[PDB]
């Protein structure tokens, strides 16, 4: 019964790391892409300087 209770607590709380192994890599790639998009969005306004 104690083994069953521990197995049930593990079913309740334990994460499935095998999907996290891919989610982490995709999240780091998305972070890099987001930094690039924010940098381009920062660069965009300053092209008005060419008109003056």
């Amino acid at each position: 019964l104690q083994d069953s209770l521990d197995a049930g607590v593990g079913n309740l709380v334990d994460a499935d790391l095998a999907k996290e192994s891919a989610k982490l890599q995709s999240l780091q790639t998305k972070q890099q892409l987001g930094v690039q998009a924010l940098s381009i969005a920062n660069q965009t306004p300053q092209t008005i300087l060419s008109l003056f």
Binding site: K30, L33, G34, Q36, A37, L38, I40, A41, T44
Partner: protein, 54 residues
């Protein structure tokens, strides 16, 4: 035409530049979000469908 008070050609060029800037902003949003439809403004039907399925 040869007027110092108005510049229709700069107005048309400004319209084209505003259009290309808006398309670049949409591309920036698709890059930083990774989604064709990230919010209800992008497309309401597919957004409601994907959200109910999620």
């Amino acid at each position: 035409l040869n007027s110092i008070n108005t510049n229709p050609g700069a107005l048309l060029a400004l319209q084209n530049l505003n259009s290309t800037n808006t398309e670049l902003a949409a591309t920036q949003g698709r890059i930083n979000t990774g989604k064709k439809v990230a919010n209800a403004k992008d497309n309401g039907a597919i957004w409601s469908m994907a959200k109910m399925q999620s």
